[PDB]
Each structure stands twice: as C-alpha cells, then as structure tokens.
Symmetry: D3
Subunit: 137 residues, 6 copies
C-alpha cells in the first residue's frame, strides 16, 4: 500500500544504470506501481527543488536535473519509503556506504544518480507532481 | 536512428525481470527513447493483434497480455530491430538459445516474457499504438 | 573447521533466491559442508523455535517455516559463524543494511529469507537437529 | 511435471560455482524438486556408469566423480530434460556455445563442471539411484 | 600451455567494460599470464596492421585504436586461441550471438569492443609486439 | 586528478576475482590510469611494508605478497583515495561490512584480497614504487 517516488537522474540514465538499479528494487521485492522515461521541464524542476530556491547551487542543480531524460517511478511495499531511503545511501556519495546505490555508483554530490522520497508526505507530493493520476497502477 | 518497440509482458513484470532485461539492452549500447509501465485495455490489445484475429489462441493471448501491467519501451541503435530479435531469441523458449532473453528467462510460449517488433514497419505501427508522440525522447 | 548452520526459508526458495544467496557464500570463500532441500516437519519447527514457544507469533512462525521447502546447509571456514551472521544482516529487514542478504532481499520480519546460527553452541545444536551425521562432509 | 537429474561435479563444487549454476536454473523458471551435497562411493559411481563400463577412461572418470563432494538435484518444468541439455551446452567445452554452462565455465571434457540426464528414462534411472524417495519434494 | 593475445579496445575501456570482460575469462578458467593498460603509438598501430595496410579503412582504424588507452593481455588455457575467438563472437556485432562478448556489448564493427588473436602464430606475433618478455608471467 | 594505488593481492588473483573487483571500480565511475599484472620482487615487498619491518608477521607477510602475481593499478577520480578506502572495507575481514570488497570476498587478515592507498601521501609514494612514470596514462 505504501508508496515512494524514485528518480534515476540524468547521469544515471546516461551511464546506462537504469536496469541495474531497477533490478535492485525488484530483487528487494518492491512492486513497480508506475514507471516512465521523461524530460523534467524547467517548471517541474523548480517546483521539485523549491526548497532550495534561495540556495546558491540552485541554478546549477536545475540545469543538471533537466540536462537529459530521467526515469521516474513509484515503488510499492511495506515501509518502502524508509527502506528505499536506506538503499540509496547518503546524499553525498562520499558518505554513502558500499552496497548502497550511491555508494556503488556515485562519486560526487552534484551528479548523485538517484532520488528517493524523504518521507511519506514528500512521496505523496512528488508522485502527484511527476506522474498523472492514471499513470499509477 | 533506427528504432524498435519492446514490451516486457505481464509475466516478465510480475517475476521481477524488468531491470535485468533493461540492463541487457543498456550494456549492449542501445538508447532508451521511451519507457513506461502501462495497463493494456481490451480494445488496445485487440487492435495490436489485427492479423492474429481470425486465429485461435487470440482470446487466450489477450487474456494474458491484459492480465497485468506491462513495460513498454522504444530502443534506438544500429540495426536495433534485427539485433533485438536476436537478443530475445526464438518465440518459443524451447528453441531459444542460452544467452538470449527467452532462452535464459522463459519456459513456455504462452508466457515468453517479452515481445520485440518483427520489422521496422511493425515497430512504427507499435510505437504509434502504445506511445503518445510526446513520450518519445 | 568451524561450522555454522544456514537455512534459506520458504520465501527465499519460492522467490528463486537460493543460487544467488549460495553464490555469496562461495564468493566469500566458505566451504559447503552440507546441503539439502527439505520440508521442515511440524516437530522440527517446534524444536527449532522452542525458544519462542510462549510468544504470540509462535503459531504463525511455525506455519511459515513449514509453508514450503527450505534449503538447509552448513558452511565451513574461519570465524564462519560470526561472519555469516554479519552477512545476513539485522533480523528485522527494516534495519538490515544494503549489501546484506536481508538488506538486499527481505522487506518484512515475518518472511526474512534466511537464518544463520547465532553462536557456536546454537550452530552445533541446529546442525544435529537439521542434518543426519553422515550428511556432513 | 517432467523432471531431470543434474549433478554439479567435484570440479564445479570446488571452484565455487554451485550458486551461480543454480541461479541460472531458478531465473529460467525451473522448480528445484530435490537437492543435496553428497559423496559418491566407488560402487555408486560404477553403477551409474553401466554402459561406459567396457570403455576406457572409465577408471579415470570414476576417480574424478568420486574425487570430492558433488551437488545432486532434480529440476522440474516443461520439457526440462531437453531444455537443461541445451542450457549445459556440448559435453566437450570447446564445442559448447557461450551462454551455456559448459561454454561459460569449463575448458576440458575431463572436468566439464556439470552433468544432466540425456533422456527422461535416464533421468528416472539417475533419480532413483542418487536420491531416496523421501528426498523428492 | 597454449596462449592467446586479447585487447580490450579504446571503446571498451571508456565504456568501463574491462572488469566484466576479464571476469568472463576468469570464470571460464583461463589464466591471466600478462595484463596492462597502454597507449598504442602511431608506429605501433601501423606495425600491428601489416596486411591491412594497402586496404582502405586502415587510417580510420589506426585513428580509433590509438584514440585512447587499451587493455592488453595474454590468456592461457586448453585451446584458448579458438576458445577465445568463440567467446568474442563474430567480428561484426550484428552477426555475433548473444552470450558472446561482442554479441552482448557491441553494436558496430567500427567499435567492436575487443580483439583476440586469430591463430597461435598471430598470437605469438601480437604478444612479442605488445608485451616485453619480462611482462609475461 | 586525484589518484590512488590499488593492488589485487596474490589470493585475489588466484581466486579469479580481478575482473569482478575491477568492475566495481568502473561501475563506481573511477578512471583506470594504470594497470598491470606483476610479480612483487623481494625488494619491493620489503620497501612497501617497511612500516611493519620490526613486527613479527613481517616475514610471513612478505612471503604472501610475493607468493604469486598481483594486479597493480592506479584509479583516478574525485576523492578516489578516501572512497576507494571505504569500498575495500576494514583491514581485518571479520570487521569488513557486506557490500565491501573484503566484506564480500575475504575471510582472514592474512589473505585479505586487496590493498588501497591509505592517504594521498601514501598513494603518491606507492604509485612511484610500483609503476614506472610512463606507465601512468
Ligand atoms: N500455443 C500458444 N499459446 C499461447 N500463446 C501463443 C501460442 N502460440 C503463439 N502464441 C502467441 O502468439 C504470438 C506470437 O507472435 P508471432 O508468431 O507472430 O511472432 P513473434 O516474433 O513471436 O511475436 P511476439 O514477440 O509477440 O511473440 C505471441 O504473442 C505468443 O505469446
Ligand atoms: N577424454 C575424456 N577424459 C575424461 N572424461 C571423459 C573423456 N571423454 C568422455 N569423458 C566423460 O564421459 C562422460 C560423457 O558422457 P556421454 O558422452 O555419454 O554424454 P554426456 O551428455 O556428455 O554425459 P555427461 O553429462 O555425464 O557428461 C562424461 O562423464 C565425461 O566426463
Ligand atoms: N567498416 C569498418 N569500419 C571500421 N573498422 C572496420 C571495418 N571493417 C573492418 N574493420 C576493422 O578491421 C579489423 C577486422 O579484422 P579481421 O577482419 O581481419 O579479423 P578479426 O577477427 O575481426 O580481427 P579483430 O579482432 O582485430 O577485429 C578490426 O580491427 C575492425 O575494427
Ligand atoms: N553541495 C551541493 N551541490 C549540489 N547540489 C547539492 C548540494 N547539496 C545538496 N544538493 C542538492 O539538493 C538536494 C538534497 O536533497 P535530498 O533529497 O536530501 O538529497 P538527494 O536529492 O541527493 O536525495 C539534491 O537535489 C542535491 O543534489
Ligand atoms: N515480530 C515478529 N514477527 C514474526 N516473527 C518474529 C518476530 N520477531 C521475531 N520473530 C522470529 O523469531 C526468530 C528470531 O531469532 P533470530 O535467530 O535472532 O533471528 P532470525 O531467525 O530472523 O535470524 C525468527 O525466526 C523470526 O522470524
Ligand atoms: N595479524 C596480522 N597478520 C598478518 N598480516 C597483518 C596482520 N595485521 C596487519 N597485517 C598486515 O599489515 C598491513 C596493514 O596495513 P593497512 O594498509 O592498514 O591494511 P591492508 O594492507 O590490509 O589494507 C597489511 O599488509 C596486512 O596484511
Ligand atoms: Mg517478439
Ligand atoms: Mg550431461
Ligand atoms: Mg578479434
């Protein structure tokens, strides 16, 4: 029942890591409730990162997240939000532990391969923001 | 430039083979131009099967193809249509060689895990049928 | 010389995770001293979980562990007991770290894919309880 | 329904290929109906080779097949006997195609890592010889 | 005893396929007798291509083979020369079967990821040309 | 720009773990700036472990590191020194976490599969000690 939003960022897609990452989630046992390759519009990127609109890395952040196609998805399963968060590893790749997605695939904070909803509330919000209602199965 | 349509069938999705299959296409070097989880409707299924209509197993097929969500995609690359047919292996798993998708993942023709356009024309037809134009990137 | 008992539970077997899990142990360098697919009898399950006989989840626990075939084994190698315990990860999948067996394959405490002897004493006891003496090589 | 007998030979076991090989059969979709680590006795080995008896390498074979523990198993699935012969590849590794077990893991016919029943009848014969009835699940 | 020369081309190195390719040769059972990252010089490249000289694409080839670092190696094992040609698959990826290196990793003959000695004599010639004697172990 | 020295020890090479380990680094995104199979000379081993020259395990240590060929390399990338150190895991395999190289492949401190420069200074020193200047690309 519980759902979380996940996004394989432009770098992850360009480096051909989509299947590998998705396999980790299926292997874990989560259900794919939604999935799609998509181009983040300038607007979506600004809404999504509104939180950091004042920050100084905001411009470069928006430029990165829209630099290429991303793979958006919604994973379903018991405590999927917290578990997916643990699977991704620390935001700053330098602190992400091995066995973790960022720990195994990312090297810098700027291009950290993936995003996972931080909380239940963030998830509900991100899902409505990235997917159309009928796209959830 | 050349592109093909691929569909991971309901059996492939429920068995959690989506990532593994996508990974093979990515390691091969093909570009993912479109991708999405979707539910095939009765009408849609029947439209896709226009020649296999006056055939027999037609109903039993539609039943399976609509039995659950499928993962649709478009792959791009040199001779990708013929190349993907080769990667999938024979339609009937028993005749598909080890190393191919159906050879390594399927056991019956009923649930042969995946579908790939037979020709460039079939691909164009399938792409227009399963994807909206804006979903192609 | 040191040995530990490991069991891939009914869920792990049903989800086709036996080879993958066994590969992690061979890759680690441990020796397979015993191995067998088996059905846990009502009696064995009760003996094995005697510790939690009074608990409330006992009935459902016994029902799960006997719900289907399991793969029992004995691994041999330096500090194998403690190392195998670390490899499995926390009992409650929610706390199991990525790279860990439960961390990568389990989502709930009820069906946590695998068991590993907790101590040397538990190992000796579990081994005699699950395997016949001549089955150890 | 249909079933076959498979044996990971002593070389396959010592090289730690048990999990990887089992994983291929599991991802393929076959059911594991029996499995066990065992030591083949002199008599047992000779009984298994009844026609190859008046042959030459007979002794050198028995020597190898009894040189260490083997992993015996029974696999179930549609046309599993022929399908497994295809998955193993040619008896002599040099003629086994990449993607098959012997093609990817073996280099000599002497130690060709695995054995699989040649026919349904050979399978029944091998199953009755290597497994007790109660070991079949 | 028998040995062959293998070169992971510039495209294979930049795409980060070195480990995956080496892993296949190791799981196969071949011994690595020599290995090194190197930059092929103009002269060196041309010397390697002595017969393909009066040919056409010669310059376009040298351009690619010297376009970046390559990983050179010598593999040892029974019939390793023919065996490695089989593992690499057809020179042109479109004709290479799934399961082979070029079949699973390449799409164009221009950048077909890897090279392997065609004969024992070519191997000796290539080994003397790319490796100093002391680099053979 | 930053570089670190890594060495797959004799055990790792003998167990055929080179490709697998190298793949983890390419997957991570680091660049291979140098690579070569080599035999550590008595002198090099003594220089490298001069730090522990007084210790009691020194003799056995030198004997191990020179017991067979090793694969030496230099990895390049952002904070590669610290990240590679984290990827390898604790020196004593017993304390190395799963998902970590030693955590997944090593069982004892004596034969712990791999080495990674501890600091920037150690790296510069190890690189000049193991590789010739022209071998860095
Ligand atoms: N006995 C059968 N039982 C169930 N489905 C069958 C049977 N025979 C054929 N099919 C179905 O028929 C279709 C086969 O298509 P066709 O023979 O025209 O070429 P194809 O390359 O296999 O196409 P596809 O990729 O869709 O399988 C598939 O959708 C398959 O599942
Ligand atoms: N030159 C040889 N050296 C060592 N063993 C050999 C040699 N030739 C054949 N063998 C052995 O002979 C047997 C070959 O069996 P056979 O040719 O009847 O069919 P098969 O399908 O290969 O059977 P199997 O699965 O047991 O290998 C194997 O056990 C194999 O190891
Ligand atoms: N159209 C082409 N474009 C670019 N390179 C080509 C083309 N045709 C052939 N080549 C190059 O020609 C060489 C083919 O060698 P050859 O046909 O003699 O046998 P081979 O077994 O393929 O050798 P190799 O392992 O070096 O590819 C390769 O180096 C390949 O990249
Ligand atoms: N130093 C930094 N440079 C660039 N981007 C940063 C930096 N610090 C944080 N960010 C960005 O802000 C966001 C942090 O939010 P959080 O959801 O906790 O992490 P993440 O998005 O990496 O999962 C990410 O989009 C991240 O890239
Ligand atoms: N909340 C719970 N629900 C179901 N089973 C539980 C619960 N808490 C503990 N258990 C069961 O009790 C046992 C705990 O013993 P332990 O050996 O430390 O862990 P595990 O068996 O998971 O390795 C397991 O069989 C586990 O499934
Ligand atoms: N108890 C021990 N037995 C054998 N060798 C040891 C022991 N303790 C330390 N060493 C050796 O000393 C070195 C420790 O240095 P360090 O660079 O921190 O670890 P490592 O080389 O394992 O990465 C290694 O070469 C290690 O094998
Ligand atoms: Mg098809
Ligand atoms: Mg056989
Ligand atoms: Mg070649």
């Amino acid at each position: 029942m519980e759902r979380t939003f996940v996004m394989i960022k432009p770098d992850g897609v360009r480096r051909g890591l989509v299947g590998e990452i998705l396999a980790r989630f299926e292997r874990k046992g989560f259900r794919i409730a939604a999935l799609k390759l998509m181009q983040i519009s300038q607007e979506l990127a600004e809404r999504h990162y509104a939180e950091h609109r004042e920050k100084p890395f905001f411009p470069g952040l928006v430029r990165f997240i829209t630099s290429g196609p991303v793979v958006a998805m919604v994973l379903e399963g018991p405590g999927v939000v917290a578990e997916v968060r643990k699977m991704m590893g620390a935001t700053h790749p330098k602190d992400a532990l091995p066995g973790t997605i960022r720990g195994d695939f990312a090297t810098t904070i700027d291009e950290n391969v993936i995003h996972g909803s931080a909380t239940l509330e963030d998830a509900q919000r991100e899902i409505a923001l990235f997917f159309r209602p009928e796209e959830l199965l």
